[PDB]
Design a protein around this nucleic acid. Structure first.
Lengths: 218, 129, 143, 55, 150, 51, 88
RNA sequence: UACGUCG
RNA sequence: GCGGCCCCCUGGACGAAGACUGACGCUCAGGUGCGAAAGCGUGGGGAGCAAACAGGAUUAGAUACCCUGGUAGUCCACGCCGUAAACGAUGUCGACUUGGAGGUUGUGCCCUUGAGGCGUGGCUUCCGGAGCUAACGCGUUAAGUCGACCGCCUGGGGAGUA
């Protein structure tokens, strides 16, 4: 709701002509996003995104670059929602089938880990198995309790996370992206011209989104 | 050199529809305003506007229905290399009637429906499909 | 010059906020003292003027050297009216032509394009400059 | 650059063995590299500069 | 109401280290009989696995066609790779009279009585791809009148 | 071309000839007048100098 | 090409006034002046095949303009080629 | 050779 | 195709502002011109290089590659020839259609507060979007979207031969 405070746009380099409607674009070789265009765009994204959030849907924040972590873990986990913060595996939506059995192995190995037989029979293989929980835990972290493929997708950079956008367009999932002036509005259904790599901007930004996901009529 | 300004106009409209262009400007003439009036009348362009005093400039505000473009295929039929003059019986229908063919008849620049109804053939300028 | 605040400090890397599209990153080499430690913490407003930039605030470590005539290396690159500008560690030096040009006996073209070693005696931190000595000519000319 | 009689300037833009230095080294926008070289050659004809260092 | 039929099976080869290795490719088209046409390629080591992969890919990747009463609407030309294809609505011009590998897609497409004539190449894998492209960019009088106002 | 030095000298250290004459300029003028191979040798030398 | 004083003299002779420097008689007379001057140049040299290509452009262009002015006003044509001594 | 499928 | 420097004669291109003519334009079968290299004719020249040629090797042989010599030729004047992987294997002219990094040559504006900032032309290089393409790739210098005129193609060989 609050006016974007401190980002005003970025990316002098590799700017994309399809971002030409969103650029004010003056200072010191770098491009300034027209935030007077961003505010209606971002309010629309909060509108439809709250609309699917009230229908009891799953949202899947996507935060692979740094420092979108742990800001996407903090914002998704502040809601009762899901996230990807480390490397987004190629095909966790379009073959979720195989990713379902990898999530199943993460559940079986944490149940085996903190409760069952973890000290049993070996030290070396037990260390092997625990670092399998680090690898499967940081890759399949947020999505491990989803149990479906989600009803929306909220990516924090459109060019850095083009794979996830490409799959959610492949599957008919609404993509909500904060694009920058280098990115491309591929199949992003609700584009938001913003700043992808400022931590102030993405914490303000995810703060608003996580605010409207759990917003409660009460 | 420019030897067919009509085909140049239709080229401007094909390449404007193909580039999601909002509007198309070109040099203007009586025949281009006649054709453009037929295109606005039949619903293939949104509007036209002729400006300038000593060098007129026709401007066609183009149409896009969905994301797709309205003018699906515009072709020039009676080119200068070989002109095509059809009678009222030989006068063709394009896409089996779903798409007009702009014929220059003696009564004026009309469509195929309008000139087959008027009972007179002429010089068939372009297929708009 | 940019005024920023420290927010993230992960060993060997310091993160400062400025207000642009990205937050700069300063190597601990600029915030380290002569004892071998750090002098800052999260929440401190430090100065940073932007490793071809960290030298501007790294020359402060060369003071304990110029206090006892520290021999360095440089090269002439600029020339005006009797004044010569030498790039010494990135600081413009001053060399008058009192001895550089006087009583020409031959083709004195061994000046523009010379790369030797000069000596320094006095330094000026008030004029951000380092005037070269005069007697050191007995080393730069024919070492 | 425009002039060839100023052999101080020309002598900066030449190597120790009489050869013209490339603009890849000395900067010198190509127009002035061309004027330069042509002036060096006019000067070598007048024996203001040498063609080589083994005359 | 699925109405599947196979057009072409071939034996392709690979040429590994020790001799050659022979694989089989199917090419099928399914369709309900009222628009809704799909084709699938599918390739496998034996013929029934190939046709099954082809059907399974063809049941998805299925496209709508705006039919007329039982036939096409306006004459349409679809091209794919080297294969240029004409079709003409033939307003009850009885019977589907199309080339091989075009008769099948037009048959399960639900159209009954068009006139065709494929030109150019007439490789079956590209003559469909030039019938769907074709039937895909054929639009109806309620779509053209939707576009241009009336 | 020349070098000299005063009495502090040990080694030749004449790398003035890895600057100009020895390596390229004399090995180049050992072999044929073309006009043709140099146009392509320079074409692929400037086409190789790329990032 | 031609001298500034020469071009100014021919514009003054053939135009309606000075500044009428694009009229058809004027262009024809300037092309004619240069054609004759280069007759003097190409009597010598004779293997300046590049400069001659420029000359044949002048000849062809003069010809085009004479054809224009012939099919616009024939009185201007006859006065013009009468005055320039061309046509043989 | 050689690829044509069920309660 | 043109590479030291200087003079003389000379062709074209591009840019800036303004003036003038007023469709005078585009393409072009036959026709005419120019057209690398080798070659030919007459007369010069001839240092290097080098077909032919000779010798030495290598080799089973070596009419070759390698070595040592070496004539025409290459160079000049005038005439002929009339061809090349004469190639961006892409005819000419014009119009329209997302971009990025350069090079080169003009010009305008702004503190020129420097080796700057903002534009606007001409030519050119690399990469790529849509589109096209059998693919490879082309991609505002198109092989995209069109128009005008020309040239040429119609299976391989025989044969570009008789």
């Amino acid at each position: 709701m609050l006016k974007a405070g401190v980002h005003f746009g970025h990316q002098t380099r590799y700017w994309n002509p399809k971002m030409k409607p969103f650029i004010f674009g003056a200072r010191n070789k770098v491009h300034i996003i027209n935030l007077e265009k961003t505010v209606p765009m971002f309010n629309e994204a909060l509108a439809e995104l709250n609309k699917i959030a009230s229908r009891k849907g799953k949202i899947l924040f996507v935060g692979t670059k740094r420092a979108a972590s742990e800001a996407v873990k903090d914002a998704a986990l502040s809601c009762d929602q899901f996230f990807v913060n480390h490397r987004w595996l190629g095909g966790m939506l379009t073959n979720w089938k195989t990713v379902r059995q990898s999530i199943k192995r993460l559940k079986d190995l944490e149940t085996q880990s903190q409760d069952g037989t973890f000290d049993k029979l070996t030290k070396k293989e037990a260390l092997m198995r625990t670092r399998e929980l680090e690898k499967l835990e940081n890759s399949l972290g947020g999505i491990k309790d989803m149990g479906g493929l989600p009803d929306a997708l909220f990516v924090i950079d459109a060019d850095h996370e083009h794979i996830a956008i490409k799959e959610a367009n492949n599957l008919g999932i609404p993509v909500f992206a904060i694009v920058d002036t280098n990115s491309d509005p591929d199949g992003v259904d609700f584009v938001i011209p913003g700043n992808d790599d400022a931590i102030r901007a993405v914490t303000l930004y995810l703060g608003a989104v996580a605010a409207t996901v759990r917003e409660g009529r009460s | 050199s420019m030897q067919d300004p009509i085909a140049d106009m239709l080229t401007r409209i094909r390449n404007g529809q193909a580039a999601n262009k909002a509007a198309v400007t070109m040099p203007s003439s009586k025949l281009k305003v006649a054709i453009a009036n037929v295109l606005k009348e039949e619903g293939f362009i949104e509007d036209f506007k002729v400006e300038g005093d000593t060098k007129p400039e026709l401007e066609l505000t183009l149409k896009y229905f969905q994301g797709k473009a309205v003018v699906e295929s515009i072709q020039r039929v009676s080119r200068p290399g070989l002109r095509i003059y059809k009678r009222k019986d030989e006068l063709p229908k394009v896409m089996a009637g779903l798409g007009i063919a702009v014929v220059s008849t003696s009564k004026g620049v009309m469509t195929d429906r309008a000139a087959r109804q008027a009972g007179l053939g002429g010089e068939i300028i372009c297929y708009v499909a | 010059i940019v005024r920023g605040v420290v927010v993230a400090i992960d060993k060997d890397v310091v993160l400062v906020d400025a207000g642009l599209k990205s937050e700069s990153a300063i190597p601990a080499e600029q915030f380290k003292n002569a004892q071998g430690e750090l002098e800052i913490q999260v929440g401190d407003e430090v100065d940073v003027a932007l490793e071809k930039a960290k030298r501007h605030e790294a020359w402060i470590t060369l003071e304990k050297a110029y206090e006892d005539a520290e021999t360095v290396t440089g090269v002439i690159n600029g020339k005006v009216k009797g004044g010569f500008t030498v790039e010494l560690n990135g600081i413009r030096a001053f060399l008058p032509g009192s001895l550089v040009d006087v009583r020409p006996v031959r083709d004195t073209l061994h000046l523009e394009g010379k790369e030797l070693e000069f000596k320094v005696i006095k330094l000026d931190q008030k004029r951000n400059n380092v005037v070269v000595s005069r007697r050191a000519v007995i080393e730069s000319e024919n070492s | 650059e425009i002039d060839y009689k100023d052999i101080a300037t020309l002598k900066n833009y030449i190597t120790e063995s009489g050869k013209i230095v490339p603009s890849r080294i000395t900067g010198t926008r190509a127009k002035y590299q061309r004027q330069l070289a042509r002036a060096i050659k006019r000067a070598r004809y007048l024996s203001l500069l040498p063609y080589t260092d083994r005359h | 109401e699925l109405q599947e039929k196979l057009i072409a099976v071939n034996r392709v080869s690979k040429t590994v280290k020790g001799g050659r290795i022979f694989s089989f490719t199917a090419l099928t088209v399914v369709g309900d009989g009222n628009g809704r046409v799909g084709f699938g390629y599918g390739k496998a080591r034996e013929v029934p696995a190939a046709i099954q992969k082809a059907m399974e890919k063809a049941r998805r990747n299925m496209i709508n066609v705006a039919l007329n009463n039982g036939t096409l609407q306006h004459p349409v030309k679809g091209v794919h790779t080297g294969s240029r294809v004409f079709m003409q609505p033939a307003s009850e011009g009885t019977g589907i009279i199309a080339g091989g590998a075009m008769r099948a897609v037009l048959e399960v497409a639900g159209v009954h009585n068009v006139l065709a004539k494929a030109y150019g190449s007439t490789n079956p894998i590209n003559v469909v791809r030039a019938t769907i492209d074709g039937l895909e960019n054929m639009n109806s009088p309620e779509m053209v009148a939707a576009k241009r106002g009336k | 071309i020349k070098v000299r030095e005063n009495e502090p000298f040990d080694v030749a250290l004449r790398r003035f000839k890895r600057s100009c004459e020895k390596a390229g300029v004399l090995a180049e003028v050992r072999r044929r007048e073309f006009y043709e191979k140099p146009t392509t040798e320079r074409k692929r030398a400037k086409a190789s100098a790329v990032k | 090409s031609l001298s500034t004083e020469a071009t100014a003299k021919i514009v003054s002779e053939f135009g309606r006034d000075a500044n009428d420097t694009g009229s058809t008689e004027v262009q024809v007379a300037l092309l004619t002046a240069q054609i004759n001057h280069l007759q003097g140049h190409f009597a010598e040299h004779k293997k300046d095949h590049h400069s001659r290509r420029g000359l044949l452009r002048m000849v062809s262009q003069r010809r085009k303009l004479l054809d224009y002015l012939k099919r616009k006003d024939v009185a201007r044509y006859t006065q013009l080629i009468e005055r320039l001594g061309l046509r043989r």
